[PDB]
Amino acid sequence: NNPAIKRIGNHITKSPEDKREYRGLELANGIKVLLISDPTTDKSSAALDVHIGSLSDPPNIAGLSHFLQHMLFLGTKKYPKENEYSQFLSEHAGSSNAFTSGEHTNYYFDVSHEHLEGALDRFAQFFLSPLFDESAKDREVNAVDSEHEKNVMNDAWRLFQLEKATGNPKHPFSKFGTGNKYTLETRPNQEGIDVRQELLKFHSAYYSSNLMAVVVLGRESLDDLTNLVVKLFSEVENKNVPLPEFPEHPFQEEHLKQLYKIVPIKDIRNLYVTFPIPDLQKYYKSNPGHYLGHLIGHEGPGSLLSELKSKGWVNTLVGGQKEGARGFMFFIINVDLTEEGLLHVEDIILHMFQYIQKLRAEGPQEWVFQELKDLNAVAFRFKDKERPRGYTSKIAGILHYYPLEEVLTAEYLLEEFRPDLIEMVLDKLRPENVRVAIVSKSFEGKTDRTEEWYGTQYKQEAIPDEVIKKWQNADLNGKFKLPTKNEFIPTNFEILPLEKEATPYPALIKDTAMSKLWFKQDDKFFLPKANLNFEFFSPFAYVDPLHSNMAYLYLELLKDSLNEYAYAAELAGLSYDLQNTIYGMYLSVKGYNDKQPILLKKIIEKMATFEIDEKRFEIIKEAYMRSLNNFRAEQPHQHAMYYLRLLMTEVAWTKDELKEALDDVTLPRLKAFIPQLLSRLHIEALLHGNITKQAALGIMQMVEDTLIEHAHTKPLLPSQLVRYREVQLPDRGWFVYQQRNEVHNNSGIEIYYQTDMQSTSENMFLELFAQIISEPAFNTLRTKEQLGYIVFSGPRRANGIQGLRFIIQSEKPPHYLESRVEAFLITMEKSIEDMTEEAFQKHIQALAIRRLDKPKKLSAESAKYWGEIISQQYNFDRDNTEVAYLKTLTKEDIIKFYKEMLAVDAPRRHKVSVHVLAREMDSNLSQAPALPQPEVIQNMTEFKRGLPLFPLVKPH
Template sequence: MLFSTRYSTFLLLLILAVATAAYRINMQSSSPTIIQSPNDQREYRSLELDNGLKVILVSDKEADKAAASLAVNIGSGDDPKGREGLAHFLEHMLFLGTEPFPDSGEYQDYISKHGGTHNAFTAHDVTNYFFEIDNNDLAGALDRFAPFFISPTFDADYVEREKNAVNAEYTSKSKDDGRRIFSAEKQAMNPAHPYAQFATGSLATLEDRPGSLIRDELIAFYQQHYSANEMTFALIGNYDLNTLEQWTQEKFSAIPKRDIIAKAKRPSLYLQDQLPLDLQIEPIKELRQLKLSFPMPESLSQYQYKPLQAISHLLGHEGEGSLLALFKKRGWAEGLSAGRGVSTPWESTLSINVQLTLVGLFRIDEITAAVFAYIELLQQGLQDKAFIERIYGEQHQLAELAFTNQEKSKAGHYAVRLTNNLRHREASQVIYGDYQWQTPTADILKPFLDQLSSNNLIRTLIAPEVETNTVDTWYDTKMMLRPAVIKLIAANKDPILKPQYREQLFLPEANPFIPQSFALTDAAAQAIPTTLIDEAGLRLWYYPEQEFRLPKAKVFINLHNKDVADNAKDRIIAQLFSHSVNELISSYTYPAYVAGLNYQLHASGRGLELSMSGYHDKLSILLEKIVDTMASLTAENVSEEEFKRYQAQLKRRLENQLKAKPYERTISELRRWLRNPSFSQEELIAALDTVTLKDVLAFNERLKQSLYIDSYVHGTLEPEAAKAISDVLKQAYQPSGERIAPAQISKVPNSTEANSTESNGTTNQYLQSLEQQHPDSAMSLYIQGQQFDQLTSDKARAHYALLAQIISSPYYQWLRTEKKMGYIVSASPFPQNAVPGLIFIVQSPTASSAEILTESEHFFADFKQQLAQLTAKEFEDHKQGLISRLVSKKKNMSEKVGHFWHNIEVNRLSFDTNEAIAKEVENIQQADIQALFESSIIEKKDPRLIFSHSSQTPDQGWTDLSTIKKADLEKL
């Protein structure tokens, strides 16, 4: 597949846009023509301010959210030597006060209060700031955003405090294998290249030094690099283009244009005379991966030809004849991806990642040889005019379909995409350029193909079993770097690759899943889904899509089985069964996935879930293949060797979940404890060890004996087509079981009658400590609401959600910025099914969970007065901000489907969960929230759970949760 996610070229095309000249739409005669989809009714305008700021404006009359993004052509690659992380630190500081708005929490408070979100990121050569907010409040957000780039205060107190936040971000990811591996990979790079240096920042790199105060260096760095002519800006809202342009001129023209010296070409990313290199890295999690990386020419200027994407499409293919198909047949690999890695204006890299089995770990030379055998085929193919035209013709055809049927994405994400694209190309290409697939000549591809050489290779082996001899500086990653091992393979081409393996490799054939029919249903529009079938063992929901008139469908099928819901072993069997089916049909289904037709089959808490999405033309063909494979799984399909491999893969995944970040562990363990039935990783691993292949093969028959099928078809399909989908399942399984309700929620004991074998204080506060090898502490404090019946649940959830809306920003500001507790701090609503609740999450490199709780309690005591002093307007702003989040307009079919399917899953057949809660929010008075805060948080009348990872946990007043007999608790 294409690196680095399961989303291939075509799925990206579904989000991005491409066009032919026929689709060119000129929205403003005085600005460049911006090419947009015929399905995109937004208006665009590009301009450049007098200060050199390049701007894209988007008027969307249907939007209820506005957004802005500003990208600066500066990043961690511009950090001064010895001040690594300075660009990232500067990104943090711009949020903490400007001359017009010196309060460090003003920007975040405003965005949060008005139903918005905000963030920023620092990459190697760009820093991007962005937000999304209710349309009516866009002007106020811009008033607070623009001064970031005109008059930040760099308050000395916050400079000192925010250094700790940057350091906390660094330490929070110190056990993150992605960060650790990348840090080790930098040791193979040219040490003179900025990419080789540490980028996050720490107390060591950001400390004050004699004659070098970090605040002075921040200001100097800002004044040196933050120049309007090195920035791009995108603004999206439901205002007309003239209004958006007026605001841009008024608020951003004051960004200074500085005398910036053009960046000099940087040294080579790798020293060619030191290649090839062999790098070995020891991970924390049980990962086994072989990565083959090739330095490449820059590719940003070749966007119309997509050379690296075309090569990656072929290398990462998973169909018949592919590298992955061969590796799976030999039992060497579980997955493979290929794609661009590093990308700068001067160079790039292409990487092939092979997810190894334990057997494959000892076959890396043969795997490497097979890769070069396939590269030889690829090089021959991409120098042949007919093959180039076929491959590019397919990609162009798929891109045209994606462009024509383009859907909207979140406004904030779209703004970021526009600013980043505007950095590299002319305004007319900010949409079109991403997925223009112009057929190149062989000469255009040759410079990239020539780099796929064993003499131009960094081969990285990542596994717990590797030999190491050193550690990297910043993450203590165990590693070993050595030269020239690959030359042993290169000397005689691929002598260790057996001829029959070479015969199994061939380039992809024509894709049979490219859709041909794009018919749209004429069924009458509906407000909500309706049932087409509701009988013993089977229910089919249907919704004909008339708002988003695209030739697409989404299908959800839940196969309910009581054994899977109630039994850890059966849940494991269901996971192994679904995995076996997925492996059997992976080569068949990959072309469908490339053509925009996707499926997922996995075990769920109630049995199995099958989902499908994409163009509906060949959906039924794919469904029949999946169901036929499920219904006919036998020992002829799955060998004992394959089963053992799948079993080991699942065990590794379960064990790796125990090594998640501390705050992630506390949340996942909290969710698990609350849900009934549920099973810990330890229980699932123990059950896994008892499962046999015979158990998995017998699952299909057991599934049939007690099966209920709950399904939903949403799209531009006719009702008869929806029924035909249901019939495929019905004929294969003949369902006759009963629907299984969602997992119930444990009611946290809240009285002296709590069923406990011992008591250690009050009986509505419970503590669970988690053990984990990580330097940070973490705490998740959960407060469970006490109104549970359906008549009061909406009202209760509205109250808790509004309290979270009001408290979230001040809690973050106090613990993260003022008290320097850590980088990860949040307060949010935490409803479980219909049970209301709140959760407070902190991960800290310096404070224990006991200290985090103490500081949280101090905050709660102080916040009581803040809440009382909230003005009527501020309270109303919070209410409207929450309502806008709850009932925001669905931007695409996926969002609408998700809303309806959630209601079906929880059996709320009025389909109005969010709307009902929003209606309750309208009726809440400020005194109601004060009373809830007083009762729930100050007086602690609501029961509490703490899941904690720390050397020092709260003790006094807290009962050990392990003493509670969960099975005897009331279920909600």
């Protein structure tokens, strides 16, 4: 017997496919613990979840628990170095994050499997004694202000708080969880608050052992993992805190039957219908909300969305239960809106109740429950193995809701059929219980009210009683039907015998004029799934802006046509993803192999014989137009990235020219485009999974045959296969492109140091440098210097060429950011010299681990092979190669590189910069070097015209 453990749970129910081993237990202090042993793991991981979050913010200091969450990283009593934690992770091939929901704070990391203890030790200290250093507090507060700034002009966040701000303002639901500089510093200062005290108070109050869950995954035995957790965690003090409850719904009497008219940032049209419901969490075994979600949100024949779409009122629908906190939930039905749809909100909603009526009239259907239960049992049996960081985080959250034994299964398995609950919930989905929100730009000027935090323009209104009544007397509508049996549900799960001449990597098993088939039968995972991947090539998909718009619209109309038929495939774990590229088209079909050929064939067949609906075309096109415009609202750092993409690629049509060319797109014009595009193609494919060589060849041949027979498709010349090149910046040059972001009041910057095209050695020079400076950049540019919340560095790789890049979104002007990266860059060379050849081998070791990290799921392996294929590099063995070569490097090699390619006065320094200025802008602290006279990019195609272009990498 052991005093530190309260108990060990019985066998934790796992999938029979899951080779990992699990143990559940409760510590004497009350912490619930899942331990995961996985002797194969390359990265170990752990997470902690506290059942406290921003719903428990002091009302006088909004965002304290989010802030507390940021502060825990910045040093503890026993590892006081501000970034000891993030550096230890960085040097041992790990990484970390955290988040704060209304009732949770969740902290997780991974590390190289061999440094679990080290990582874990430093990590426990967050919950034992965090310094909340007084000057760390001052600095890190800006990070939060930026976190928020980002969100201010963001349509989803505004809506998210706007909901909170129109229920009982007495309710903790109505709190602002993020916080900013104002609520965490400027206001607490005015009100004489010692924040470091409040951070100590709140931590000591709530970070209590009984409100805590831990998951630990590593190669260690279950006994080792046990002793280990006992060791680092027995010592967290139990303050016995009562777990917050919220029996009162934030939406009370007066908050029902309300209409809100809301002005968005982007030009989007949306209708949010919401009903309050009580907390369904405890019904999880039988789950009535999912049942109604499945049905109301259904998209097949008969479905609510079908009629709404056919009347050309909505395009998409989400519906179902949506979490609140302990005590209250919501049930929602949300759709977007065509221009017509906007003028028929009253009608749309009526149909909604009409459909709800049909449900009441039919009553609970057990076979529908059966279907849900079986799909979930299949989902569970053959669930892909999760990346450990995500897994631990996820389970730590659910340890607060399910018996130990159930944690794994709890969010999957269904057990009890409950017509009473289905009925009981259904009863709440009534007009007298409804809230309605319309988000449109048509409400510009028309609003009389403003949200405190985001500044959202809205009007409120009681919904007229005659209207409610029209909705209450909603009849049966003969357009609405329950779904029928899902024929796509799989039933064949046999894992075909592993073929006699299978190989570690995909073999090129076909190389004809029309197609190039890559194939590997799965030798790792043995689930009954497959990925089927196809690059279709056409000169016509991108030949000009107009053709781009058509390649898009075409494909959107295809998806839209197929949607009803394909929904069923998707509930059944068969899904497809089809879009236009700058080379033509991409098609990926993923999921259980069993009915896979069916979907594929229906897709190809539809493409090749496609019949456009006039009304659909007009609607999709209107949306695409708004969509191009809505780019204007994107975050500064993405404008930055977008412009850089445009500047450095041989051919790239701007959103502006796409928008411009889009009126010229007529129904006649598109009918003609489709066959044009479809008549000359080359297909390169990856087929990877539970399938045989022959099965694969058939599938490939079937695609081709379907095209030939229906579109008369013929090959493409080898020489037509035109890959685009990257621009070649001149030795010692420096260009700057600059633009205003007319929406966000932050600025964005991307700085690109182009090195030399990809190749084993030039790759590892860049990667190792990036590894070395990865966490110093973050810690310098963010933690210390607080330039912004978004601070990123790392490699850039496009069109076979590469370089180092920095990405920052910040309140300071881009020119200023320039010099601080430049400063930082000296600081780097200055410390690559100071660093021990040990410190240096540590960093080699980290990259090594990162690079050699084995895929845990088919998709992840597929993806790697795809990367090789679409980049025409075909270096399937690249990792062992590039790592082998890596170990070879030294302090000299890298210092040489820095001075050659990167340093301010490098012989071959090649620098480009995109400045995206804030809504309104113009024209202790280390040394920034004096920088050259920047050659300001005037015009994008002039710039491209006056420079060489790099080669394309030769295929391995």
